[PDB]
Amino acid sequence: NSTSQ
Amino acid sequence: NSTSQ
Amino acid sequence: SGFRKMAFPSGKVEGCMVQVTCGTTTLNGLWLDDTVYCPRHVICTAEDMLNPNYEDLLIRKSNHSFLVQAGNVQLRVIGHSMQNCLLRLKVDTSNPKTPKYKFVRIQPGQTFSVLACYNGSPSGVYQCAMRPNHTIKGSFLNGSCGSVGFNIDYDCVSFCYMHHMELPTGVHAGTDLEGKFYGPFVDRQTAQAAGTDTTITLNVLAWLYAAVINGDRWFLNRFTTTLNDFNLVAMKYNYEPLTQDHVDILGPLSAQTGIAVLDMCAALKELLQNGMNGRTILGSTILEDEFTPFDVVRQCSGVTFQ
Amino acid sequence: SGFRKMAFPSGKVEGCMVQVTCGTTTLNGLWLDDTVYCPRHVICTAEDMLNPNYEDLLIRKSNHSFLVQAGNVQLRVIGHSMQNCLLRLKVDTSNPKTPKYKFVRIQPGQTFSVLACYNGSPSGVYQCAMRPNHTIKGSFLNGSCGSVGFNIDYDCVSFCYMHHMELPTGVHAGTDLEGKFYGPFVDRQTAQAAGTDTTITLNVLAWLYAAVINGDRWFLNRFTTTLNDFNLVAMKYNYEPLTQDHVDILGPLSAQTGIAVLDMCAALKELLQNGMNGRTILGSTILEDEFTPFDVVRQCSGVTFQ
């Protein structure tokens, strides 16, 4: 998945 | 010599 | 002399950073006139991130759900709308330090400055290029969302990026100040990846022109190429193909240094094929694709060291 | 993630740039409270540069010989004195945008931001280190004199550099805000050179710690060294010798990453001896000595990607 910062 | 900017 | 990655001075932009908080999430927002822009994902949490729906998640919110802070001071929301991937929050005060500004959508290969922010508080400024795969090689931690990217002409700020997320490869993805993502990306939390990237041919050639303008020549050669023969070489080495518009763009810099482009493509072709031969160009041992032709004009000398 | 050269935001400093003109020379000056600092060589020309004498050249000048401009506005001098290599010009107005500030003398290896200026008008911001030979690898053209270098703690600006000149190698020389040169250099025009430089050992090790904090490990090895065995290797490869104070400084970063220093010196020793083996560290193919340990702490993550 990915980090929404 | 050198450039005094 | 000297050639460094140079960012634009960041004062005019520092005056527009604000903190934006909704429930338990805090991120930076951008305050122009009586509007404050920020990532729409500020209103989100739990699994709210894996499968969200912002039209739905947003209707269950009011103006006083947003606590925009401006230093130790505080702003009250009086309107809100979503624009694509951003929120547009109208506020009671209008920004006394609002600079002349506009919003543009940069294209792959163009460059801009980034003002990195945590809690509406600017921490640092670096230069970055839009990568052909539409991501940037930024430096952000959690809390960096809402940090913006920009250029300055004369006295006018062109906003072009707002930061939203970090991809699994450790590169960043965001949107223009209209809410539209650069790239295929979305502010959901799925198995997304950066498509394979490409070296920015136009820029490397701009760079070599600067190496020459500074006064180094060692990579030149007596040869020439046709566009087509270069692109056949370039494709393998993973470069973007070069086109006439690009060749035209290296116009003036050809003029100022008296070196024809296709002649530099030959130089380049050679560097691709021979390697660096254990020396540096303009201090570097790789080929630098994050300076545009406009960046070389601006920073480099108006006259050549011949 | 990401690791980039990051300069401090430059707003607080932009508010102190002014233009300073004396006869036919123009250069940037620095306006704090009711004082404006600039290179003393602003009053100089013809051969006035080869064999000058500023005590003499300055007594043949009055307050209205200096035309300090602040935007389109204008300041009048009411006092002036020389301090070592700088002029201190008292003026009628006190700077409304004067930030909290102080003046410090940085040491070789420390780093700072540079705000490049032409005609009192800020054009760009980059990060730079003081090189052991006391020069910087800046990017300046003619007109850049008076551009300043600085750090920010919290809300406080520490000025540490004012630009004066470009050496024959294309590197720059200047002074703290007390007028004292860094290096043996003088504001005359003679056969001066940069002494041979040295790679900043402390920094490269700080850098490798960041490469690890980001989450890459490939350069590690099972070995260890004594300080002394490293310095014998280092000396040849042209590194600064490492000392206990340096080793102590890599303290916390050892702690956060669980890697002992002398263990990293071994890693380093190996990289010196084996070369990079055709890959990158934190994106680079050389060893990067312009990040301090403090710069890695500030920019990098508080937790490690283990």
Could A4 and C167 be called an inter-chain contact, meaning their C-beta atoms sit closer than 8 Å?
A: no
With beta carbons less than 8 A apart as the criterion, state whether D133 and D181 touch.
no
Q: Is D175 inside a domain boundary? A: yes
With beta carbons less than 8 A apart as the criterion, state whether C148 and C29 touch.
no
Indicate if D191 and D204 belong to the same structural domain: no
Q: Is C268 inside a domain boundary? A: yes
And the tokens for D172? 């720059």
Distance CA D261, CA C39 (A): 41
Q: In chain B, what residues touch D165 (CB-CB under 8 Å)?
A: 2-5
User: D197, D222, D245 — which closes off a domain?
Assistant: D197
Distance CA D185, CA D191 (A): 11
Tell me the CB-side half-sphere exposure of residue D185, using CA atoms within 13 A.
32
Distance CA D9, CA D151 (A): 9
Could C145 and A2 be called an inter-chain contact, meaning their C-beta atoms sit closer than 8 Å?
A: no
Indicate if C63 and C184 belong to the same structural domain: no
With beta carbons less than 8 A apart as the criterion, state whether C177 and C194 touch.
no
DSSP E strands: which ranges in C13-129? 17-22, 25-32, 35-39, 68-70, 73-75, 77-83, 86-91, 101-103, 111-118, 121-129
Could D124 and C8 be called an inter-chain contact, meaning their C-beta atoms sit closer than 8 Å?
A: yes
Q: How far apart are the first and last CA of chain A?
A: 13
Whether D187 contacts chain B with CB within 8 A? yes
Distance CA D202, CA D187 (A): 31
And the tokens for D300? 């990098």
Distance CA D89, CA D15 (A): 17
Of C165, C190, C191, the CB nearest to A3: C165
Indicate if C132 and C7 belong to the same structural domain: yes
- Give the distance from residue C164's alpha carbon to the nearest chain A alpha carbon, in angstroms: 6
Q: Is D286 inside a domain boundary? A: yes
Q: Is D306 inside a domain boundary? A: no
Nearest CA in chain C to D288: C284
With beta carbons less than 8 A apart as the criterion, state whether C119 and C191 touch.
no
Could C124 and D2 be called an inter-chain contact, meaning their C-beta atoms sit closer than 8 Å?
A: no
> Residues near D143 by Cβ (< 8 Å), separated by ≥ 6?
B5, D26, D27, D118, D119
Within 10 Å of residue D90's Cβ, how many Cβ atoms? 15
What is the distance, to the nearest Å, from the Cα of residue C262 to the centroid of all Cα atoms in its chain? 28
Helices and strands per DSSP (H, E), number in chain B: 0, 0
**In what helix (H) or strand (E) does residue C165 lie, and over which residues does it extend?**
strand C156-166
Core vs surface per residue D109-144: b (16+ CB within 10 A) or e? bbbbbbbbbbebebbbbbbbbbbbbbbbbbbbbebb
The H-assigned helical ranges of chain D are 11-14, 54-59, 201-214, 227-236, 244-249, 251-257, 261-274, 293-299
Classify residue D21 by burial, with Cβ atoms within 10 Å: 0-12, 13-18, 19+.
middle
Nearest CA in chain C to A3: C166
Indicate if D203 and D290 belong to the same structural domain: yes
Q: In chain D, what residues touch B3 (CB-CB under 8 Å)?
A: 142, 165-166
Task: Record the resolution, in angstroms.
Answer: 2.6
Q: Is C306 inside a domain boundary? A: no
Residue C91, helix vs strand vs coil: strand
And the tokens for C117? 């922010």
Question: C44 is in which domain, residue-wise?
Answer: 15-99
Classify residue D263 by burial, with Cβ atoms within 10 Å: 0-12, 13-18, 19+.
middle
Indicate if D53 and D113 belong to the same structural domain: no
> Residues near C214 by Cβ (< 8 Å), separated by ≥ 6?
C1, C3, C282, C300, C301, C305, D170
Distance CA C59, CA C68 (A): 19
Indicate if C2 and C146 belong to the same structural domain: yes
With beta carbons less than 8 A apart as the criterion, state whether A4 and C189 touch.
yes
Classify residue D165 by burial, with Cβ atoms within 10 Å: 0-12, 13-18, 19+.
buried
Q: In chain D, what residues touch C166 (CB-CB under 8 Å)?
A: 1
Distance CA D216, CA D280 (A): 10
Q: In chain C, what residues touch A5 (CB-CB under 8 Å)?
A: 140-145, 163-166, 172
Q: Identify the CA nearest to C108 among candidates C39, C197, C178, C38.
A: C197
Indicate if D1 and D130 belong to the same structural domain: yes
Distance CA D70, CA C29 (A): 31
Q: In chain A, what residues touch C57 (CB-CB under 8 Å)?
A: none
Tell me, what amino acid is at C19?
A: Q
Catalytically annotated residues of D: 41, 145
User: D43, D78, D99 — which closes off a domain?
Assistant: D99
Rg (CA), chain B: 5
Q: D248-254: list long-range contacts, CB under 8 Å, 24+ apart.
A: D249/D202, D249/D293, D250/D202, D250/D205, D250/D206, D250/D209, D250/D293, D252/D297, D253/D206, D253/D209, D253/D213, D253/D293, D253/D296, D253/D297, D254/D209
Identified catalytic residue from C38, C85, C145, C300? C145
Tell me the CB-side half-sphere exposure of residue D113, using CA atoms within 13 A.
30
Indicate if D141 and D208 belong to the same structural domain: no
And the tokens for D154? 């919290």
Q: How many CB pairs under 8 A join C and D?
A: 104
CATH number, position C27: 2.40.10.10
Q: In chain D, what residues touch B1 (CB-CB under 8 Å)?
A: 168, 189-192
**C153 phi/psi in degrees, rounded to 5:** -100, 130
Work out the angle between the directed axes of helices D201-214 and D261-274 (0-180°, nearest 10). Answer: 100
Distance CA C119, CA D175 (A): 35
And the tokens for C288? 């630098």
Could C144 and A3 be called an inter-chain contact, meaning their C-beta atoms sit closer than 8 Å?
A: no
Window 56-115 of C: residues touching A by CB (8 A cutoff) are: none
And the tokens for D181? 């040169």
Indicate if D139 and D210 belong to the same structural domain: no
CA distances in angstroms from C12 to C98, C204, D137, D225, D253, listed in the order given: 8, 30, 27, 50, 35
Question: By a Cβ cutoff of 8 Å, what residues of chain B touch chain D?
Answer: 1-5
Q: Is C251 inside a domain boundary? A: yes
Q: Identify the CA nearest to D82 among candidates D116, D46, D52, D105.
A: D52
Q: Is C134 labeled as catalytic in the residue annotation?
A: no
Residue D14, helix vs strand vs coil: helix
And the tokens for D260? 């002992």
And the tokens for C164? 């939203």
Q: What is the bridge-based pairing of β-strands C101-103 and C156-166?
A: parallel
Q: A–B contact (≥3 CB pairs within 8 Å)? A: no
What is the distance, to the nearest Å, from the Cα of residue C51 to the centroid of all Cα atoms in its chain? 28
And the tokens for D275? 């070369």
Residue D136, helix vs strand vs coil: strand
Q: Is D32 inside a domain boundary? A: yes
**Any idea what DSSP says for residue C263?**
H
CATH number, position D263: 1.10.1840.10
- Among positive and negative, which fits the CA dihedral C160, C302, C3, C236? positive
And the tokens for C23? 């429930």
Identified catalytic residue from C22, C38, C41, C300? C41
And the tokens for C50? 């894996």
Distance CA C247, CA C252 (A): 11
Distance CA D126, CA C183 (A): 29
User: C197, C226, C253 — which closes off a domain?
Assistant: C197
**To which residue do tokens 């103006």 refer?**
C63
- Give the distance from residue D142's alpha carbon to the nearest chain B alpha carbon, in angstroms: 5
Tell me, what amino acid is at D198?
A: T
Named by the residue before each, gaps in chain A exceeding 2.5 A from C to N are none
Nearest CA in chain C to D154: C123
Q: Identify the CA nearest to C68 among candidates C1, C127, C22.
A: C22
DSSP string, D149-162: EEEEETTEEEEEEE
Q: Identify the CA nearest to D87 among candidates D187, D172, D10, D173.
A: D187
Could B5 and D164 be called an inter-chain contact, meaning their C-beta atoms sit closer than 8 Å?
A: yes
How many residues are listed for chain C in this entry?
A: 306
Distance CA C51, CA D128 (A): 45
Indicate if D7 and D129 belong to the same structural domain: yes
With beta carbons less than 8 A apart as the criterion, state whether D169 and C305 touch.
no
With beta carbons less than 8 A apart as the criterion, state whether D233 and D197 touch.
no
* Domain count within chain C: 3
What is the distance, to the nearest Å, from the Cα of residue D146 to the centroid of all Cα atoms in its chain? 14
Distance CA C147, CA C258 (A): 41
And the tokens for D57? 């050249």
Indicate if C188 and C211 belong to the same structural domain: no
With beta carbons less than 8 A apart as the criterion, state whether D193 and D168 touch.
yes
Indicate if C203 and C290 belong to the same structural domain: yes
Distance CA D78, CA D41 (A): 20
With beta carbons less than 8 A apart as the criterion, state whether C119 and C143 touch.
yes
Within 10 Å of residue C42's Cβ, how many Cβ atoms? 20
Q: Is C64 labeled as catalytic in the residue annotation?
A: no
**To which residue do tokens 């002399």 refer?**
C1
- Give the distance from residue D183's alpha carbon to the nearest chain B alpha carbon, in angstroms: 15
Residue C89, helix vs strand vs coil: strand
Q: Is C7 inside a domain boundary? A: yes
And the tokens for C269? 């072709």
CA distances in angstroms from C21 to C13, C188, D221, listed in the order given: 20, 19, 46
Could B4 and D191 be called an inter-chain contact, meaning their C-beta atoms sit closer than 8 Å?
A: no
DSSP E strands: which ranges in chain D? 17-22, 25-32, 35-39, 68-70, 73-75, 77-83, 86-91, 101-103, 111-118, 121-129, 148-153, 156-166, 172-175
- Give the distance from residue C200's alpha carbon to the nearest chain A alpha carbon, in angstroms: 26
Nearest CA in chain A to C145: A5
And the tokens for C239? 């470069």
Residue D115, helix vs strand vs coil: strand
